[PDB]
Design goal:
The structure is cut from a larger assembly and holds chains A (about 170 residues), B (about 600 residues), C (about 90 residues) and D (about 300 residues).
Chain A: E1 7-13, H1 19-29, E2 34-38, H2 42-53, E3 59-62, H3 68-79, E4 85-88, E5 101-106, H4 113-120, E6 130-136, H5 139-152, E7 157-158
Parallel strand pairs in A: 1-6, 1-7, 2-4, 2-5, 3-4, 5-6
Chain B: H1 4-17, H2 20-28, H3 35-42, H4 53-74, H5 102-111, H6 122-139, H7 143-163, H8 173-181, H9 186-198, H10 205-222, H11 234-243, H12 245-259, H13 263-269, H14 275-290, H15 301-316, H16 323-333, H17 340-349, H18 358-363, H19 367-371, H20 378-389, H21 392-408, H22 416-438, H23 441-447, H24 451-457, H25 462-473, H26 476-483, H27 486-494, H28 505-512, H29 515-540, H30 542-547, H31 553-568, H32 570-585
Helix pairs in contact in B: 1-10, 4-5, 4-6, 6-7, 6-8, 7-9, 10-11, 10-12, 11-12, 12-14, 12-15, 15-17, 16-21, 17-22, 21-22, 26-27, 28-29, 31-32
Chain C: H1 15-21, H2 50-62, H3 78-84
The chains are: A alpha/beta (about 170), B mainly alpha (about 600), C mainly alpha (about 90), D mainly beta (about 300).
PDB class: gene regulation
Keywords: transcription and export complex, trex, RNA export, RNA packaging, RNA binding protein, gene expression, gene regulation
Entry title: Structure of the human TREX core THO-UAP56 complex
């Protein structure tokens, strides 16, 4: 069963249009091995992937509008450290079995607590520390964050200006 | 008014932490006047004078005008024209240098004032580097020479290395400096590297800006590159290294030891570094191993990652590993046996030495042992580094006793000490094998003292003593030396397994059955017949020895012959069994 | 003034490396090791710790000719065998 | 501020920034070089021909297309003091000397095979042609007889002369540049310059500097008198394929495998106009008189950059 002990979860309150720029700021400060960014649709996913490839960031997109074999091929290319950022609308469950993953951006809000858990929680073998950052845009974000805190008994504090380096990286 | 100058210098320092005087100076250096120029430059902040472009250009013009004769005579590059400087006509001139002494006094006095502002004139950088290289390769190939060498090492650390840190991306000025740097011993080179890493970037606000920019660009391309695109990204790191190798390599080493992946992309992107940058990368590896936990009941992951990076980067690129072995030997002298790990990796990665089943075990008991080159150039560098600095015997004799020091001096949990002793013993065995392989009877017999000297003087146990002495032999005096039946003691500890029981024809015919293959099979059969004759001849001399060989009669034999031998290594275990059974059988019960 | 840069002390600019370069048996022999067992002869004694009992068995291998001796009396516990061999 | 010269040239390029293309051949254009004065411009193509354009006012017309070769033409060079004489080194193991005044083959010389790069001695007396198996042949330009041959055992990419015609510069793929004494060809020096291959070398018309390009996106500007690397330009990202010096030596234009050509001031090295269209370039030349430059990017066509708008 997926657990949440060993993951740091924050939130940032902003608009909907500023979620791109703000994201870049994070990728300009936070040190990471591989970053998985979750969106809600395929159009926004392809737009974000193209916007990241327009930058020097190597980004690969795995959305729900793909064949299963293509999804597996792209996920295997991403597992071999061939590309850093993975813009995924969803996964195949089982948490996140990729040990190299450090940061997880909830660019959009998931459906319910099971979705937030499958997005945040991991199922690795050696890597127990990691960071998860969810963007807050309206009151629904705060309500679902409170629901997550009530269901999983976790803490979702506000993101400060400085983060400890060894707190989420072993 | 000389005070607004101090205020503006304070401003320059502070903003980075977050004129008739100079008009005279430029016109006072323009004719001949050096003494009054010194008097003017001393009455202001340290580098406020040469911080401007005009004053630095005037000082450099004066310097090369005074230095012209020495350079024209002993420093012009082969196959150039050169620009005669037409020395100045004043009688108050600084008396142009002629041979390495007037240079010393006047030119070093006038170089002290420049600092990291030689970058305005790269022509003087080259002239001074060439003069230094000529002086080194001439004189060092002596009190005055020692003083000149010290002054040259000071001029380097003060002017040359900081000025090389402000040139944007000079891959040629980093390969011109290493024309002179390849003549210093590695201790002076490491001094200069440590000083211009830890001290020059603190002062000199321009150097602080350069450090900030280099760390920024290093953070940029590191989190960004791929496993896919290596060397569209090796070029960026190459340029950053041409600029500031110390900072760049320190940051990327931190990243390597932190993430423990992305180590192969990095040891692959380090393809466009200059030789000076390889020398600086070696020092950064050493420093990252030395300065910084570290136990956590099991050897830490960061040390394993550093060791893997070191093995890879020393196997791939020519990096002149001399400080690494001396550092490992010093750590052993200090009583710490963890860095032996990385040493193992080196000997394991750039020599192809690398549990085993009975098939390969019998094969390891002379072509089958080499079977089980791509490591004919790296092993050459390893052997050269071992022979030049005389580090084979010291390292072996250090491990031989440090294996006891690990367990008894506690240098816990009873599971960490076991693995550490195991690692030390295995590294000793592997290094002794490498030496016996590649330092042949010539270097071996000459640089390995006899057992009469080892156990008596260099406090070494009998096991490692005989392990190192065996290749020299390939008796009564040796026995009396070892005890201080003695003949039995020497006979047992001298004979290996290879000269007691012959294999190999099966696997030989399997692998052979192809002109090269046929030639290899013929050579292997020749070796097999030679070993047959070897075993026959060895068993021949055994009879008369058995005649005069010899309760607790076997108990002394049992412990001090069987136990260390059988415990030492698996081949030694099979030998210890075969010996007793075959020879001692033909008291056994 | 750059009158002299070096000295005979190898500096090795890094201050930690300065210590290593300018820096420069292991068997207590049966009496410097124990030093207590004879003086203590079992709740919190010294022959109740394996981290010492293991090293005593590693030391009794090189010396103490009564180690490989055929005792064969089936001593129930290592502390019993170890105290008799001191 | 940047400089006075940079601002002046930026004004000139603000007024004159129209690039126009002209149809040369029916295949990939390998090399394009200008005349001795600057009226004619020739270009050699993969369709084993060499076209010759006449620069009239602002657009250059097609004067002729010289036919005949056994393989693709890899390099062109014009006589350094004769406006109507040039040489085309091709595959097919030959080198032909064309005349523009009468449109006829003046001479043909058979070499040891697979020529790549040539240059004409700044006197106009000897032609040096290197081939794909690192052999450099020295031919007498007036007698059309091979007078010297040299094997080097490294890989020599591009060759040049001291421009006083008393030294010979080769660039070896190991990352060095070799200097030989010309009139009696004996190796004089080797300069370890770049961490990787040296692909091109050019001498500016004035005689102060010479520039080399490396296979790691570096251009280095060596000083001819003292052989000192003064400054390195690093704004490309791919191996530098071609260099050129302006008609006076202040501007240097470099083109490589990434999407734009860049002009840089020689004295400062900071930056100047950069032309960004598409289709990585591999051959670039300036004009001997005017400040307008031709190039061949990416069925083949020659583009200009300068006068009109």
């Amino acid at each position: 069963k997926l657990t949440l002990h060993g993951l740091q979860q924050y939130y940032v309150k902003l608009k909907d249009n500023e979620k791109n720029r703000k994201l870049f700021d994070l990728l300009d400060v936070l040190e990471f091995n591989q970053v998985v960014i979750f969106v809600k649709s395929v159009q926004r996913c392809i737009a974000l992937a193209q916007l990241l490839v327009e930058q020097n960031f190597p980004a690969i997109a795995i959305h729900r509008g793909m064949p299963q074999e293509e999804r597996l091929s792209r996920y295997q290319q991403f597992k071999d450290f061939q590309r850093r950022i993975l813009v995924a609308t969803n996964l195949f469950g089982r948490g996140m079995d990729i040990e190299r993953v450090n940061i997880a951006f909830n660019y959009d809000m998931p459906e319910d607590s099971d979705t937030y858990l499958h997005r945040v929680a991991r199922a690795g073998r050696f890597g127990t520390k990691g960071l998860a950052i969810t963007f807050v845009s309206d009151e629904n974000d705060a309500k679902i964050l409170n629901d997550v805190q009530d269901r999983f008994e976790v803490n979702i504090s506000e993101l400060p200006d400085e983060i400890d380096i060894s707190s989420y990286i072993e | 008014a000389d005070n607004c100058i101090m205020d503006e210098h304070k401003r320059e320092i502070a903003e980075a932490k977050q004129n008739q005087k100079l008009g005279l100076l430029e016109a006072l250096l323009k004719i001949g006047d050096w003494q009054h120029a010194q008097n003017i430059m001393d009455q202001m902040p340290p580098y406020y004078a040469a911080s401007h472009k005009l004053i630095a250009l005037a000082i450099c013009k004066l310097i090369h005008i005074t230095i012209e004769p020495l350079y024209r005579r002993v420093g012009v590059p082969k196959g150039a024209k050169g620009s005669p400087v037409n020395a100045l006509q004043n009688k108050r001139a600084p008396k142009q240098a002629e041979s390495f002494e007037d240079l010393r006094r006047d030119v070093f006095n006038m170089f002290c004032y420049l600092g990291p502002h030689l970058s305005h004139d790269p022509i003087l950088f080259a002239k001074v580097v060439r003069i230094g290289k000529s002086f080194m390769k001439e004189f060092q190939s002596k009190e005055k020479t020692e003083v000149i060498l010290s002054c040259l090492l000071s001029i380097t650390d003060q002017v040359l290395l900081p000025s090389l840190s402000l040139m944007d991306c000079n891959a040629c000025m980093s390969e011109e400096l290493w024309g002179m740097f390849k003549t210093f011993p590695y201790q002076h080179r490491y001094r200069l590297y440590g000083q211009w890493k830890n001290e020059t970037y603190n002062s000199h606000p321009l150097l602080v800006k350069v450090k900030a920019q280099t760390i920024d660009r290093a953070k940029y391309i590191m989190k960004r590159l791929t496993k896919e695109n290596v060397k569209p990204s090796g070029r960026q790191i190459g340029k950053l290294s041409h600029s500031n190798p110390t900072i760049l390599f320190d940051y990327i080493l931190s990243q390597i030891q932190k993430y423990d992946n992305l180590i192969t992309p990095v040891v692959d992107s380090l393809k466009y570094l200059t030789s000076l940058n390889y020398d600086v990368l070696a020092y950064c590896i050493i420093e990252a191993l030395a300065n910084p936990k570290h136990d956590d009941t099991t050897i830490s992951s960061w040390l394993q990652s550093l060791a893997s990076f070191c093995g890879a980067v020393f196997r791939k690129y020519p990096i002149d590993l001399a400080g690494l072995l001396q550092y490992v030997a010093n750590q052993l002298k200090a009583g710490k046996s963890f860095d032996l790990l990385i040493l193992k990796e080196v000997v394991q990665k750039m020599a192809g030495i690398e549990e085993m089943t009975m098939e390969q075990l019998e094969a390891m008991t002379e072509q089958l042992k080499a079977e089980g080159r791509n490591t004919k150039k790296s092993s050459q560098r390893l052997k050269d580094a071992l022979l030049d600095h005389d580090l084979a015997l010291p390292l072996c004799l250090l491990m031989a006793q440090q294996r006891n020091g690990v367990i008894f001096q506690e240098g816990k949990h009873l599971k960490l000490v076991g693995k550490l002793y195991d690692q030390c013993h295995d590294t000793l065995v592997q290094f002794g094998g490498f030496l016996a392989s590649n330092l042949s009877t010539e270097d071996y017999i000459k640089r390995v003292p006899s057992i009469d000297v080892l156990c008596n003087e260099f406090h070494t146990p009998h096991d490692a003593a005989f392990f190192l002495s065996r290749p020299m032999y390939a008796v009564h005096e040796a026995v009396v030396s070892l005890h201080v039946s003695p003949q039995f003691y020497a006979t047992f500890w001298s004979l290996t397994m290879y000269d007691l029981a012959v294999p190999t024809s099966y696997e030989r015919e399997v692998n052979k059955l192809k002109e090269r293959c046929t030639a290899l099979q013929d050579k292997l059969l020749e070796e097999e017949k030679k070993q047959m004759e070897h075993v026959q001849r060895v068993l021949q001399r055994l009879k008369l020895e058995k005649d005069n060989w010899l309760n607790e009669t076997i108990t002394k034999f049992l412990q001090l012959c069987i136990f260390p031998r059988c415990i030492f290594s698996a081949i030694d275990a099979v030998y210890c069994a075969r010996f007793v059974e075959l020879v001692h059988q033909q008291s056994t019960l | 003034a750059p009158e002299d840069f070096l000295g005979k002390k190898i500096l090795m600019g890094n201050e930690e490396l300065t210590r290593l370069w300018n820096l420069c048996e292991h068997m207590p022999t049966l009496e410097e090791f124990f030093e207590e067992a004879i003086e203590q002869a079992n709740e919190y004694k010294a022959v109740n710790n394996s981290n010492y009992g293991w090293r005593a068995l590693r030391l009794l291998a090189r010396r103490s000719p009564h180690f490989f001796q055929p005792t064969n009396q089936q001593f129930k516990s290592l502390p019993e065998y170890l105290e008799n061999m001191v | 501020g940047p400089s006075r010269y940079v601002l002046g040239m930026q004004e000139l390029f603000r007024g004159h920034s129209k690039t126009r293309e002209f149809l040369a051949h029916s295949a990939k254009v390998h090399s394009v070089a200008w005349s001795c004065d600057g009226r004619r411009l020739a270009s050699g193509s993969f369709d084993k021909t060499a076209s010759v354009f006449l620069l009239e006012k602002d657009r250059l017309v097609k004067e002729n297309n010289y036919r005949g070769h056994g393989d693709s033409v890899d390099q062109l060079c014009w006589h350094p003091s004769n406006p109507d004489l040039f040489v085309t080194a091709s595959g097919d193991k030959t080198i032909r000397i064309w005349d523009v005044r009468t449109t006829k083959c003046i001479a043909t010389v058979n070499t040891k095979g697979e020529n790549i790069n040539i240059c004409w001695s700044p006197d106009g007396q000897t032609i040096a042609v290197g081939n794909k198996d690192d052999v450099v042949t020295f031919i007498d330009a007036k007698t059309h007889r091979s007078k010297a041959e040299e094997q080097f055992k490294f890989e020599v990419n591009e060759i040049s002369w001291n421009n006083d015609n008393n030294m010979f510069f080769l660039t070896n793929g190991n990352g060095c540049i070799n200097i030989l004494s010309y009139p009696e060809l004996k190796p004089v020096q080797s300069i370890n310059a770049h961490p990787s291959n040296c692909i091109c070398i050019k001498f500016d018309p004035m005689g102060k500097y010479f520039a080399t390009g490396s296979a790691d996106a570096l251009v280095s500007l060596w000083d001819v008198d003292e052989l000192v690397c003064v400054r390195c330009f690093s704004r490309l990202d791919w191996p530098v394929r071609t260099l050129s010096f302006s008609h006076d030596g202040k501007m240097l234009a470099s083109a490589s495998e990434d999407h734009f050509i860049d002009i840089a001031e020689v004295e400062t090295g900071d930056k100047l106009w950069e032309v960004q269209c598409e289709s990585p370039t591999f051959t670039v030349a300036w004009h001997p008189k005017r400040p307008l430059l031709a190039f061949a990017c990416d069925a083949g066509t020659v583009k200009l950059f300068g006068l009109p708008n």
